[PDB]
Design a protein around this ligand. Structure first.
Ligand SMILES: O=C1CCSCc2ccc(cc2)CSCC2CN(C2)C(=O)[C@H]2CCCN(C2)C(=O)[C@@H](CNC(=O)c2ccc(Cl)s2)N1
Lengths: 28, 251
């Protein structure tokens, strides 16, 4: 739980997924 | 998922599959929140009118999966359940209030590229992220349409809706322990969860700390992806005190 919600194949390798920016852009 | 797309491998490593053992059958979705704890919807486990009142021995969970049908050697892990816990104040006769259940695995599941828990929110995260217009992500092996099933895990992003619009979309007594997400008819874009998505996660990613947080549990909709209708999700944060009571007792 110290390391929850960080995805091995995405956040741990600093790769963006295909649609997560959509979430991002919906905060502005 | 309706109007979604295939998940990339590893995109949702807290995604969990809930099976009935005999006859082996996929019931619902669910999410990994620790190495022994899985979060689903109560109605997935308890719904008398549909002959659903399960015990630990009846079910198992599959974790790390991508394909609905095909087995995945060294990726997928099957787990037995030590104990089911349904919220004491879960309402199924009316409105699906407090549609929340916890399951304890009989063994810790090992983490990998395909298996990884998601974070539960706190006051800051809940206050920051649970705003109307803000989008979250819903995943599952549920139907692709209201009236087949997908070959691989589906994913869709959906805006949280203002309470008044939720309230007016249905004649179901809606409670503060659920919120609704989905597009308004005029917004052009479509998508929703559907039959089989129940119990799966509604996740948002925090711009503060880059983490994924489970804000909701897919609970119910009247149909899938209908105009003027919206999806209803259990509010994970409003129920977090129960989640902690159970997990902190372990029993
Ligand atoms: O709703 C669902 C999930 C619930 S199932 C079991 C169930 C039915 C009724 C009640 C409680 C449990 C007490 S009443 C409170 C409420 C509104 N109510 C659920 C209903 O209208 C359901 C009526 C039966 C037909 N469906 C909708 C579905 O077969 C299907 C349709 N929808 C979906 O699967 C979802 C679409 C968007 C999300 Cl999120 S989930 N499943």
């Amino acid at each position: 739980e110290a390391d929850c919600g960080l995805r091995p194949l995405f956040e741990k390798k600093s790769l963006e997924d295909k649609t997560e920016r959509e979430l991002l852009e919906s905060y502005i | 998922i309706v109007e979604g797309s295939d998940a990339e491998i590893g995109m949702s490593p807290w995604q969990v599959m809930l099976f009935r053992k005999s006859p082996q059958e996929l019931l619902c979705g669910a999410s990994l929140i620790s190495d022994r704890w899985v979060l689903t919807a109560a109605h997935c486990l308890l719904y008398p009118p549909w002959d659903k009142n399960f015990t630990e021995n009846d079910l198992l969970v599959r974790i790390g999966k991508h394909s609905r049908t095909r087995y995945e050697r060294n990726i997928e892990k099957i787990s037995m359940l030590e104990k089911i816990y349904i919220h004491p104040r879960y309402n199924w006769r009316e409105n699906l209030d407090r549609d929340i259940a916890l399951m304890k695995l009989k063994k810790p599941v090992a983490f990998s590229d395909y298996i990884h828990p998601v974070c539960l929110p706190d006051r800051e995260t809940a206050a920051s992220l649970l705003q109307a217009g803000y989008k979250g992500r819903v995943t599952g092996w549920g139907n692709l349409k209201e009236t087949g099933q997908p070959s691989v895990l589906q994913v869709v992003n959906l805006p949280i809706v203002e309470r008044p619009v939720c309230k007016d979309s249905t004649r179901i007594r809606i409670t503060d322990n659920m919120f609704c997400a989905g597009y308004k008819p005029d917004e052009g874009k479509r998508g929703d969860a559907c039959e089989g998505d129940s119990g799966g996660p509604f996740v948002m990613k925090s711009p503060f700390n880059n983490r994924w947080y489970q804000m909701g549990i897919v609970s119910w909709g009247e149909g899938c992806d209908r105009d003027g209708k919206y999806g209803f999700y259990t509010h994970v944060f409003r129920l977090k005190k129960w989640i902690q009571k159970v997990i902190d007792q372990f029993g």
